[PDB]
Design a protein around this ligand. Structure first.
Ligand code: W0D
Ligand code: W0D
Ligand code: W0D
Ligand code: W0D
Ligand code: CA
Ligand code: CA
Ligand code: MG
Ligand code: NA
Ligand code: NA
Ligand code: NA
Ligand code: NA
Ligand code: NA
Ligand code: NA
Lengths: 315, 320
């Protein structure tokens, strides 16, 4: 029915589990107090590469049973970091395509992490043209950060671990950008324990997933959105939308202020260096609209999706 | 390629997981010392109904259609008076539909009494195959029921393979699974599963030498059923492999180890005495296999071996 099924998640779990962390679930008395809920924090900020994206990235690069000869990406962010690590694990080269006009800062980070830089011109046109060429020349693959089925399946493994670590969980709260994580999680939860709610959390400044659920059709952001939640600037896409349409119970939007306040709360009160994008799920459970969630939904697992925060800019 | 796929096994585990137990994997230092290996015991003797067969039976009740024109079974029917009939009855009871067991007139009174106390209805046949088939097809049609074969029905094979999803998840460093074989529904479902997910893991069958059709069939390269009903204390593996399980077993099972009656008996007693688990002798088959001389041919690299303890339905009074 969908671009993945739970069988692809179980395959991904076998495929990646030797090479990723089974990240802990932590709790917070104060957050419980503040929300009225029993909260559980699935700590993907402690995952390899500092976000959950190594799960999709390793699943897409690695074959369970022409294997990729290289990986190529436009991402200098969590996706690119994840793809680079996965490539290194598989013994294959990783290429990041970066504008010539990119920060000098960021160039050095990439090569420190062990990717090879291929400079393009700042045009999207030129980025895509160079990526395609590098891909073809190296016989490599590009991995879509959210729409690739192997990526969506890899992300689903988050929910397998949560359902084992929190056996009486009533809901998962998942930040949504392109929806590969949300959609992998929804597939998994609805397959294994469909009474468990799946909720998305989204910046109201980037509210395409909410708009699409409201309208009943895929409505991507018209323009690049402006949000401190830099990891959820992607719109949902054609492979994640049908899953989220059918298997996600509700979408909670949160303001920029709510994201910032929730992020600071986690830093000061839980001492976890989450990135603001990971504060989106916390802000959702703190939000006014979340009070409409039934009192029967008590045990809520929020995915702290990443910790890759620029402490230089760390309001 | 085969009568089931890994996708069918996952569908089965979604279908049955709210009603079966995720059985534990136990260990024993003593059996580790005796075998040279790192053993893991998948405890299907603690499953609902006392054997793994609830997996295939519940999957069949929740997935098979009686007819082109009716999507929901209105009853279940089988010729198995043993672990399969018990499991099928439980599965039917869960789904609120009646169970019928077709029973020879010649069956012991104790068999007839038990079937009825569990909550199945008995339908009598003549001991003849002709009669058994006639009666079961009659019952199946009259009741708008499904007939559920203990080992060759694809939905049953797919449900038994869920054991291997649990094992792989429970024992991430496992090197081999050892599985007792009779009709091979459990072996073939496990083989499909392990070979789709992590084919580097070996799949080994264990079989009584007194009922060695799966060994003879693998040896000859074609399906060779027992010519006569076998005599073995391993009563749950007296069926021969069949047309749906044989191709899977031929292609995806790495080796077959046969064990004598005395080896089955000694292994069963060893598990009772040294692990304090009430396995039925049939479930002692896989333990005997790993203790057997021929198992020493298994590479020393194959270190972490999970043996399925397939059932605990033992006649305590009879206990040979
Ligand atoms: O620049 C970041 N991190 C460092 C980085 N980014 C890479 C990209 C490719 C390979 C290694 C990398 N190392 C960032 C921005 C948003 C989240 O993380
Ligand atoms: O840009 C990065 N991460 C996302 C981010 N987004 C922010 C928003 C505000 C403050 C800090 C933030 N950090 C990065 C660079 C190097 C490592 O991570
Ligand atoms: O005699 C046995 N079981 C009793 C039984 N058999 C049933 C069949 C249907 C319903 C309930 C049943 N109860 C046996 C033989 C081998 C293992 O167990
Ligand atoms: O006959 C039954 N099971 C198989 C069996 N086979 C044996 C052989 C020796 C000792 C115990 C055994 N038990 C049965 C009836 C009721 C429940 O289980
Ligand atoms: Ca969005
Ligand atoms: Ca046999
Ligand atoms: Mg599609
Ligand atoms: Na950790
Ligand atoms: Na509950
Ligand atoms: Na029919
Ligand atoms: Na599983
Ligand atoms: Na190994
Ligand atoms: Na067939």
């Amino acid at each position: 029915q969908y671009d993945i099924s739970f069988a692809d998640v179980e395959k991904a779990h076998i495929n990646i589990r030797d090479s990723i962390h089974l990240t802990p679930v932590l709790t917070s008395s104060i957050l419980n107090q503040l929300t009225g809920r029993n909260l559980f924090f699935k700590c993907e900020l402690f995952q390899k590469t500092g976000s959950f994206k190594i799960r999709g990235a390793l699943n897409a690069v690695r074959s369970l049973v022409r294997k990729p000869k290289a990986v190529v990406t436009h991402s200098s962010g969590n996706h690119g970091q994840a793809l680079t690590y996965a490539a290194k694990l598989e013994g294959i080269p990783a290429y990041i395509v970066v504008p010539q006009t990119a920060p000098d800062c960021k160039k050095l980070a990439i090569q420190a992490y062990g990717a090879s830089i291929v400079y393009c011109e700042p045009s999207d046109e030129s980025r895509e043209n160079v990526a395609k060429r590098v891909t073809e020349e190296t016989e490599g693959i590009m991995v879509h950060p959210n729409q690739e089925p192997a990526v969506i399946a890899g992300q689903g493994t988050i929910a397998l671990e949560v359902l084992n670590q929190v056996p009486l969980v009533d809901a998962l709260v998942v930040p949504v950008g392109g929806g590969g994580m949300l959609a992998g999680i929804a597939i998994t939860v609805k397959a294994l324990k469909p009474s468990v709610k799946v909720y998305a959390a989204e910046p109201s400044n980037a509210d395409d997933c909410y708009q699409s659920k409201l309208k009943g059709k895929l409505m991507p952001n018209l323009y690049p959105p402006e949000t401190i939640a830099d990891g959820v600037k992607s719109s949902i896409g054609l492979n994640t939308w049908p899953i989220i349409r059918d298997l996600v119970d509700d979408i909670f939007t949160v303001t920029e202020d709510e994201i910032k306040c929730a992020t600071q709360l986690v830093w000061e009160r839980m001492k976890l260096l989450i990135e603001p994008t990971a504060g989106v799920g916390v802000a959702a459970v703190l939000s006014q609209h979340f009070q409409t969630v039934s009192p029967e939904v008590k045990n809520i697992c929020i995915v702290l999706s990443g910790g890759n925060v620029d402490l230089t800019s760390s309001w």
